[PDB]
Every structure is written in structure tokens, then in C-alpha cells.
Design an enzyme around this catalytic site. Structure first.
Site, mmCIF file in Angstrom:
data_model
loop_
_atom_site.group_PDB
_atom_site.id
_atom_site.type_symbol
_atom_site.label_atom_id
_atom_site.label_comp_id
_atom_site.label_asym_id
_atom_site.label_seq_id
_atom_site.Cartn_x
_atom_site.Cartn_y
_atom_site.Cartn_z
ATOM 1 N N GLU A 115 21.311 17.322 10.079
ATOM 2 C CA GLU A 115 19.880 17.052 10.221
ATOM 3 C C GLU A 115 19.415 15.893 9.330
ATOM 4 O O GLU A 115 18.497 15.157 9.673
ATOM 5 C CB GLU A 115 19.093 18.320 9.898
ATOM 6 N N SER A 169 7.750 23.515 10.640
ATOM 7 C CA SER A 169 7.448 24.911 10.319
ATOM 8 C C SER A 169 7.182 25.071 8.818
ATOM 9 O O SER A 169 6.147 25.605 8.418
ATOM 10 C CB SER A 169 8.599 25.829 10.750
ATOM 11 N N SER A 172 10.323 19.966 4.285
ATOM 12 C CA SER A 172 11.540 19.443 3.678
ATOM 13 C C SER A 172 11.211 18.094 3.061
ATOM 14 O O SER A 172 10.489 17.290 3.659
ATOM 15 C CB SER A 172 12.659 19.275 4.709
ATOM 16 N N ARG A 184 18.426 15.700 0.089
ATOM 17 C CA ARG A 184 17.306 16.633 0.160
ATOM 18 C C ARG A 184 16.885 16.985 -1.265
ATOM 19 O O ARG A 184 17.693 17.458 -2.061
ATOM 20 C CB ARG A 184 17.668 17.901 0.959
HETATM 21 N N1 LIG Z 1 2.048 21.669 20.746
HETATM 22 C C1 LIG Z 1 2.379 22.277 19.499
HETATM 23 N N2 LIG Z 1 2.820 23.540 19.489
HETATM 24 C C2 LIG Z 1 3.140 24.162 18.337
HETATM 25 N N3 LIG Z 1 3.010 23.520 17.159
HETATM 26 C C3 LIG Z 1 2.563 22.249 17.108
HETATM 27 C C4 LIG Z 1 2.235 21.585 18.310
HETATM 28 N N4 LIG Z 1 1.825 20.360 17.992
HETATM 29 C C5 LIG Z 1 1.882 20.211 16.693
HETATM 30 N N5 LIG Z 1 2.317 21.342 16.110
HETATM 31 C C6 LIG Z 1 2.528 21.475 14.701
HETATM 32 O O1 LIG Z 1 3.773 20.908 14.435
HETATM 33 C C7 LIG Z 1 4.535 21.854 13.746
HETATM 34 C C8 LIG Z 1 6.002 21.785 14.062
HETATM 35 O O2 LIG Z 1 6.524 20.521 13.780
HETATM 36 P P1 LIG Z 1 8.051 20.242 13.960
HETATM 37 O O3 LIG Z 1 8.472 19.016 13.110
HETATM 38 O O4 LIG Z 1 8.378 19.996 15.474
HETATM 39 O O5 LIG Z 1 8.750 21.522 13.413
HETATM 40 P P2 LIG Z 1 10.133 22.128 13.774
HETATM 41 O O6 LIG Z 1 11.228 21.028 13.824
HETATM 42 O O7 LIG Z 1 9.971 22.872 15.106
HETATM 43 N N6 LIG Z 1 10.442 23.272 12.596
HETATM 44 P P3 LIG Z 1 11.691 23.164 11.504
HETATM 45 O O8 LIG Z 1 12.917 23.990 12.010
HETATM 46 O O9 LIG Z 1 11.184 23.773 10.223
HETATM 47 O O10 LIG Z 1 12.198 21.716 11.209
HETATM 48 C C9 LIG Z 1 3.949 23.185 14.023
HETATM 49 O O11 LIG Z 1 4.060 23.993 12.917
HETATM 50 C C10 LIG Z 1 2.530 22.878 14.234
HETATM 51 O O12 LIG Z 1 1.824 22.977 13.056
HETATM 52 MG MG LIG Z 2 12.257 20.023 12.583
#
Ligand SMILES: Nc1ncnc2c1ncn2[C@@H]1O[C@H](COP(=O)(O)OP(=O)(O)NP(=O)(O)O)[C@@H](O)[C@H]1O
Ligand SMILES: [Mg+2]
Ligand SMILES: Nc1ncnc2c1ncn2[C@@H]1O[C@H](COP(=O)(O)OP(=O)(O)NP(=O)(O)O)[C@@H](O)[C@H]1O
Ligand SMILES: [Mg+2]
EC number: 2.7.1.33
Lengths: 342, 342
Positions: A115, A169, A172, A184
Site C-alpha cells: 500500500e 476510514s 495513515s 509510515r
Molecule cells: N460516497 C462515499 N461513501 C462513503 N464514504 C465516503 C464517500 N465519499 C467520501 N467518503 C468519505 O471518505 C472516506 C473513505 O475514504 P477512503 O480513502 O476511500 O478510505 P478507505 O481506503 O476505504 N479506508 P482504509 O482501509 O482505512 O484505507 C469515508 O470514511 C468517508 O468519510
Molecule cells: Mg484507503
């Protein structure tokens, strides 16, 4: 079919390279057609058309780079669609979690990619090819004064050193010192899933977009306890937050506060805490350019200005908050770029 | 009547020195009697009897040092009681906010004292006189292993350098380098008032104690999204929190989660974020002893162990979480000690 995939805890991000410089198999044509003629896929898939990179030259081919997202919750549906109709470069936690699920697609070879490598490589790549002639990276000039505060391009031709703050979520934080030297630094669990989780509990909102819309109407001072609430006035100014949700310890204030106030207070709380963590890692790492990525900030101008103001105020101008047009997609892209190695 | 008073955004803390080595005025006698023969004052006042320092020699007098607290919300009642029946050393935000209110007590002279000076001076003082022969300061040995994890005394004869993490309504962080050299390093607004505010909203609890009691029964993993939820397994272990309240983005999980789970998740979220901030300031300040004060941690063993574990784990043993028996009262005490100057 050239794909890079970042499967996170909340969203799946997909980068797709479409060749434009083209007797191939019918279903290969049908996938290409499906992806380029639709901007909504099923009920939850979305192509971010405005982010498209056009006439990019990649792997000795001319094409368009498309950016697509859908909820990780709906990955089973994406996989089912896959089995009805390939080397897949994938990163994010779900690359490991759903490894066996991807292999239900006969012969499909899943390549899990670090990642860290993917995010940095994808970031550097996009900035180097530019956003169709324009700056990928931008900051908010005069971040403290609303009258003068405006979005302006920012040059990253020599991007080292760099503090990357990835708000998904959770959070990082990476320090990028050179091309093959990055690490990191730390992380917090108070990220976008905290904002969205708390906000849903407090307000009953049922999308990220609805939470942002509520927050835009509310007054966070109705839930937060300020310096002036404690001191009576004003190096902390009276309007600065002393205790997030600190006024909700009073029963009478909990009963007068609205859903919009609470959405806003959740947003302000999460954002400001992230700015503060970011500032602290930057001092620790002795890095003054701090770039924010992830999807917490998509269609979220409020959080972007809060971060810009906070880094600028607290640091007396020494720290600069930076943002990226393709902020949610760099893992997906760096994964795609790892394809030649296999 | 020798008083020191720390008026915070949530609680008033009062240190009172009672001379025991004694034809004085009747109402002076009646106040002394009122304070020493009662442990509850009105409906919200409490004397912390177990914290009493006995046979202390102060200002050339032998006496007992008493520790008393009540909500800042009830300060008007305390003042009214005052006008019915003096130099007052006072610190905390309320020393400024309620300055005019204290002066409604005819002739009463209010001396506002710097909160920094008071806290450090009061801390150093109490540690130097000891807790009736025993250690004022303590840590949790083998903080990572529940079987071996136990409270044990800790020596502060040479307390420099020292990182002081003050968790009240918000969080203030101090670096103490020597007797007259100390500074406020930073602060966050996510403190005890955030825990208590959010928890009241989420659970309907109506005291700090009830929130702690709920949290003690709950399962925070029911609200939090863990590393293993995202990766499927495990340098982050699978049980570590990836996103606080991150599982509350799912409607079905919000509807199955209990008030106790939510209390606990609020507590874990606030505490762990504070540990992380603390660790970051300690690295920045190059200080390896981190002391926690304020009242967020009173009758709160859970938060104390969380901090001890987190500082110890993240730092590989280089950072030590320290705690103080009189953690809520050092401002009140340092204020009392500023009395000779006037
Ligand atoms: N359409 C959407 N649906 C859900 N969350 C959204 C949306 N748009 C923006 N967000 C926000 O964007 C965040 C997720 O961003 P993202 O970088 O895609 O995380 P992730 O890669 O899924 N999680 P992680 O495993 O911790 O890296 C969510 O927590 C929301 O706060
Ligand atoms: Mg992510
Ligand atoms: N009986 C109580 N009532 C209210 N809060 C309590 C109580 N006991 C413990 N607490 C916790 O202790 C916190 C307040 O600690 P404290 O150090 O006294 O803050 P403060 O001095 O009033 N605020 P500040 O102005 O920010 O310094 C509250 O936020 C609670 O989380
Ligand atoms: Mg205080």
C-alpha cells in the site's frame, strides 16, 4: 484490460486505462463499452468523469485513464459480475481480505502490492504527468482570511520531503524523503469513518453527502465548548474550541441542539484533530509541506479550509496544507503501474 | 481561612489548609466546622477524604490539607453562600470569567494566578511532601500483560524533564524542563468533555460515573472497525482499532449496538487519541516520562490502563505513562501556595 485496484475498508477505487490507439474478443469489447458509455454502474458504482486523464501515454500505448469507485460492501456484486462475463494489481487491506474471493474468477491472477509503494508511486506519477496540463496539487492562499482565501495551484516538481496524510476510514501518515526512501510515521483511528459513523448515530444521516449537507447548515458552537465559555473571553482566541462536544454535557443544551449543529461539530472535531496530528508529525519529521489524500475530503471544501487554516495559523505560516485533485485514487493508480513487473 | 481554587470549565477544585496547632470569630469557626464535619456539601459538593494530607507543615503552621470539588455550574450557589456568612488565590479560566462575581463578596481580594505556574508548582509541591509517607506518583508495571499489569509507586525526586498531560474539558500539554523553565507545548479539544458530551448524546447517561459504569460493561469492537475487519487479519495487529466508530456507518450495526458498547467506544476513542497525541509531543520534546493529570482519569482505571498500554506498546518501552493520586487538584494547590506573595 488494464486495471489497478485499491480496496479499502469503506471504498473500492478502480483506475482503468482505456487504449484509444487501437478483432478482439467480444466480452473484452463489451467491458470497455460498458465502462466508457456509463457513468453509474449498478446502484452504487460511479465513474469520476471530471478526473479523467486524456491522451496519456502509458506502457507505450496512448489512452485515457479513468477513475471509478464503489463501496467495499458491494465488492461481492462486482465479483459476481466478473464470474458471468486477466491479471489484477490490487492494494489496500481488501487485497488480502478478499484474495480468495478474486480467485473464484477462473485463472485470474491476483497480485497484492504494498500500500505504501502504490500510494507514493501513484502520487508521484499523477503529479508528473499533470492533470491534462493543469496542476494536480493546490493549496488555499491566505488560508486564514475568508475574503482572500482562494484555491491556487502548487508546484511539486521536487516533492521531497513530503508528509502525506491519508484520511480514509482512519488516518495513515507517511513521510516521503526520496524516491525509494519513505516510511509510515504513525496513524490515528479518528478519520473519515469516525466522522461518518458518529454523524450517522447523532443525526440519522444515511450518506456521506447528506452528512456534509447537514454540516453546511449547522452551527458547531452549539455543541462545542469554546475558550470564551471557560475564560469569558480570550495565546488562545475566545472562539477557539476548548472542548469538542463539551457543551453537550448539559442536558438543556443537548435538547436544543439540532442535527445540523451536530453534523458540523462532528466534522469540525474530526478535521481539527487531524490537522493537529498532522502538524505534530510534520514538526517531528521536520517537513513543512503536508499533503492530504483519501476520500474524507472529496466534495468537502469545509474540511479542506479547516485544515488549511489550522496548519497555517498554528505554524505561523511555516506549514502548508496541500491538496490533490486525484486524492482518493493514488493507491489504485500505483497498483496499475506495478503491472509491468509481472 | 487559607484557600486555593482552580475554577475550570467543568469542575471547581478547592484546596483548604486546616490548622491543627491552634478566641477567633464565630463564622470563621463555623466554616472550619462545616468543612471538616461534612463530606458532602449541598447536593453537588464533595470532599475527597482519602486524598487528605495530614500534619503537613505549611507557612510555619501545622495542619491538614483538604481537597474539595463541585461543578462550575454551581459556583453561583457557592458565592451566594459566601455572601451570607479574605484573600482568594484562584486560577483556571473561571478565575477571569467569574472575577466580578467573586468581588460581590465585600472586601474580598481576588488574586488571579497563571494556570501554568500553579499546576507545576502544585505538582512539584505535593510530590515533594509525599502522600502521607507514600508515593504521590505511580505507573502500571508490565502495562501490556493483564496478568502481570499492576499499580506500582514511581519516584520523582528529580522530575525534570517532564511532559504533563492535563485532561480536563479539553487537553493541555506542558513540557517541564526545570524549576523556572516550562512551557505549554500544544493542546487538543478532544478531552474529558468530549467523552462526557458524546457519551451523554449516544447513551443518555447523566453523570460521568454512570458513563464509566456503562463503558465497563460494553464491547467497543461492536462500534469500532478493527484492522482485521479491513485486512481479514494482522506492524498493526488485527485487534487494533483502524477506525473509531467506523462500524457505525452500517445501518444494521447501529441498530444492534448497545448503550454500553457506545459508552466504551467513546471512552476508548478519546483515551487512545490522547495517548497518541501524548506520544507525539514526547518525541517532539524528547521527554520520556509522561504524567497525566486532570479529572478525566478519576475513578477511571480503564483509561489509565489504556494510556499505560499505548505509551508502552507504541514506544517499545521508551515512554512511560505516569499517574498522580492528586491528579485533579494541582492547580488549586499551586494557587494556595501563591498566597505568601500577597
Ligand atoms: N460516497 C462515499 N461513501 C462513503 N464514504 C465516503 C464517500 N465519499 C467520501 N467518503 C468519505 O471518505 C472516506 C473513505 O475514504 P477512503 O480513502 O476511500 O478510505 P478507505 O481506503 O476505504 N479506508 P482504509 O482501509 O482505512 O484505507 C469515508 O470514511 C468517508 O468519510
Ligand atoms: Mg484507503
Ligand atoms: N463528577 C464529575 N463531574 C463531571 N465531570 C467529571 C467528574 N468526574 C470526572 N469528570 C471528568 O473530569 C473532567 C474534568 O476534569 P477537570 O480537570 O476538572 O477539567 P476542568 O479543569 O473543569 N476543565 P478545563 O477548564 O479545560 O481545565 C470531565 O470532563 C469529566 O470527563
Ligand atoms: Mg482544569
Amino acid at each position: 484490460p488494464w486495471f489497478g485496484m485499491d480496496i479499502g475498508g469503506t471504498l473500492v477505487k478502480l483506475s482503468y486505462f482505456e487504449p484509444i490507439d487501437i478483432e478482439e474478443v467480444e466480452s473484452l469489447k463489451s467491458i470497455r463499452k460498458y465502462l466508457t458509455s456509463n457513468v453509474a454502474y449498478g446502484s452504487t458504482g460511479i465513474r469520476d468523469v471530471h478526473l479523467e486523464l486524456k491522451d496519456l501515454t502509458l506502457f507505450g500505448r496512448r489512452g485515457n485513464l479513468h477513475f471509478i469507485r464503489f463501496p467495499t460492501q458491494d465488492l461481492p456484486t462486482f465479483i459476481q459480475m466478473g464470474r458471468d462475463k486477466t491479471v489484477l494489481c490490487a492494494t489496500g487491506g481488501g487485497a488480502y481480505k478478499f484474495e480468495k474471493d478474486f480467485r473464484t474468477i477462473g485463472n485470474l491472477h491476483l497480485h497484492k502490492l504494498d500500500e505504501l509503494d502504490c500510494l507514493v508511486k501513484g502520487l508521484l506519477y499523477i503529479d508528473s504527468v499533470s492533470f491534462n496540463g493543469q496542476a494536480e496539487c493546490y493549496y488555499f492562499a491566505n488560508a486564514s482570511e475568508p475574503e482572500r482565501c482562494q484555491k491556487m495551484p502548487f508546484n511539486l516538481d521536487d516533492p521531497y520531503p513530503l508528509l502525506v496524510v491519508n484520511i480514509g476510514s482512519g488516518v495513515s501518515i507517511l513521510a516521503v524523503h526520496s524516491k525509494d526512501n519513505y516510511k509510515r510515521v504513525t496513524g490515528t483511528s479518528l478519520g473519515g469513518g469516525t466522522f461518518l459513523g458518529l454523524c450517522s448515530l447523532l443525526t440519522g444521516c444515511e450518506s456521506f453527502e447528506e452528512a456534509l449537507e447537514m454540516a453546511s447548515k449547522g452551527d458547531s458552537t452549539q455543541a462545542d465548548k469554546l475558550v470564551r465559555d471557560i475564560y469569558g473571553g480570550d495565546g488562545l482566541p475566545g472562539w477557539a474550541v476548548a472542548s469538542s462536544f463539551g457543551n453537550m454535557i448539559y442536558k438543556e443544551k443537548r435538547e436544543s441542539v439540532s442535527k445540523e449543529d451536530l453534523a458540523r461539530a462532528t466534522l469540525v472535531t474530526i478535521t481539527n484533530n487531524i490537522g493537529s496530528v498532522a502538524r505534530m508529525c510534520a514538526v517531528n519529521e521536520k517537513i513543512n509541506r503536508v499533503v492530504f489524500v483519501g476520500n474524507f475530503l472529496r466534495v468537502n471544501t469545509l474540511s479542506m479550509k479547516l485544515l488549511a487554516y489550522a496548519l497555517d495559523y498554528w505554524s505561523k505560516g511555516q506549514l502548508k496544507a496541500l491538496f490533490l485533485e486525484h486524492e482518493g485514487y493514488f493507491g489504485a493508480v500505483g497498483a496499475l503501474l506495478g503491472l509491468p513487473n509481472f
